């Protein structure tokens, strides 16, 4: 698969929220908003995995800087 790192997530953004936000760019194999091991709160970042590389490429470029919830996010490739 092809993964996109999504940073600067507003605290209220859930895995489902980023899954929903990136759905328009292509088929998604899964998503995950990373959590804090102490509070269980969002760590402020997550990942969205696409089956296709071009879709992911388009999501990274188009979503970078977009407002998602209470914050403008950051996008990039991820392993």
Short mmCIF file of C-alpha atoms in Angstrom, two decimals:
data_model
loop_
_atom_site.label_atom_id
_atom_site.label_comp_id
_atom_site.label_asym_id
_atom_site.label_seq_id
_atom_site.Cartn_x
_atom_site.Cartn_y
_atom_site.Cartn_z
CA UNK A 1 0.00 0.00 0.00
CA UNK A 2 0.83 3.70 -0.14
CA UNK A 3 0.71 5.70 3.08
CA UNK A 4 0.21 9.37 3.86
CA UNK A 5 1.25 10.92 7.16
CA UNK A 6 -1.20 13.56 8.37
CA UNK A 7 0.20 15.94 10.96
CA UNK A 8 -1.07 18.90 12.97
CA UNK A 9 -4.42 17.22 13.65
CA UNK A 10 -6.91 19.09 15.81
CA UNK A 11 -7.53 17.11 19.06
CA UNK A 12 -11.12 16.20 18.13
CA UNK A 13 -10.18 14.48 14.85
CA UNK A 14 -10.75 10.72 15.01
CA UNK A 15 -9.54 7.91 12.77
CA UNK A 16 -12.96 7.94 11.12
CA UNK A 17 -12.71 11.69 10.53
CA UNK A 18 -9.46 11.47 8.59
CA UNK A 19 -10.71 8.34 6.82
CA UNK A 20 -13.73 10.39 5.76
CA UNK A 21 -11.66 13.45 4.81
CA UNK A 22 -9.38 11.45 2.49
CA UNK A 23 -12.00 9.11 1.05
CA UNK A 24 -12.50 11.37 -2.01
CA UNK A 25 -8.99 10.70 -3.34
CA UNK A 26 -9.32 6.94 -3.70
CA UNK A 27 -9.79 3.52 -2.13
CA UNK A 28 -8.44 3.40 1.41
CA UNK A 29 -7.14 0.23 3.07
CA UNK A 30 -7.24 1.80 6.53
CA UNK A 31 -6.59 4.78 8.81
CA UNK A 32 -5.31 5.54 12.28
CA UNK A 33 -5.08 8.62 14.49
CA UNK A 34 -2.24 7.97 16.95
CA UNK A 35 -3.14 8.17 20.64
CA UNK A 36 -1.31 9.14 23.84
CA UNK A 37 -0.55 6.12 26.05
CA UNK A 38 -1.18 8.13 29.22
CA UNK A 39 -4.42 10.01 28.48
CA UNK A 40 -5.65 8.08 25.45
CA UNK A 41 -6.11 11.47 23.77
CA UNK A 42 -5.12 12.07 20.14
CA UNK A 43 -1.38 12.54 19.70
CA UNK A 44 -2.07 15.11 16.99
CA UNK A 45 -1.14 12.91 14.03
CA UNK A 46 -2.21 9.85 12.09
CA UNK A 47 -1.98 7.90 8.86
CA UNK A 48 -4.21 7.09 5.88
CA UNK A 49 -3.29 4.16 3.65
CA UNK A 50 -4.33 3.97 -0.01
CA UNK A 51 -4.29 0.92 -2.28
CA UNK A 52 -2.94 3.08 -5.13
CA UNK A 53 0.14 5.34 -5.12
CA UNK A 54 -1.27 8.02 -7.42
CA UNK A 55 -4.35 8.46 -5.22
CA UNK A 56 -2.07 8.89 -2.21
CA UNK A 57 0.11 11.29 -4.17
CA UNK A 58 -2.98 13.36 -4.98
CA UNK A 59 -4.21 13.27 -1.38
CA UNK A 60 -0.82 14.48 -0.06
CA UNK A 61 -0.69 17.41 -2.50
CA UNK A 62 -4.34 18.49 -2.30
CA UNK A 63 -4.90 18.01 1.45
CA UNK A 64 -1.65 19.59 2.61
CA UNK A 65 -2.62 22.75 4.48
CA UNK A 66 -6.37 22.11 4.40
CA UNK A 67 -8.41 22.89 7.48
CA UNK A 68 -9.66 19.68 9.05
CA UNK A 69 -11.54 20.41 12.24
CA UNK A 70 -9.87 23.08 14.31
CA UNK A 71 -6.50 23.03 12.56
CA UNK A 72 -4.74 23.18 9.21
CA UNK A 73 -3.11 19.80 8.64
CA UNK A 74 0.22 18.75 7.13
CA UNK A 75 0.67 15.87 4.69
CA UNK A 76 3.59 13.75 3.51
CA UNK A 77 4.50 10.24 2.49
CA UNK A 78 5.02 7.62 5.19
CA UNK A 79 6.47 4.12 5.37
#
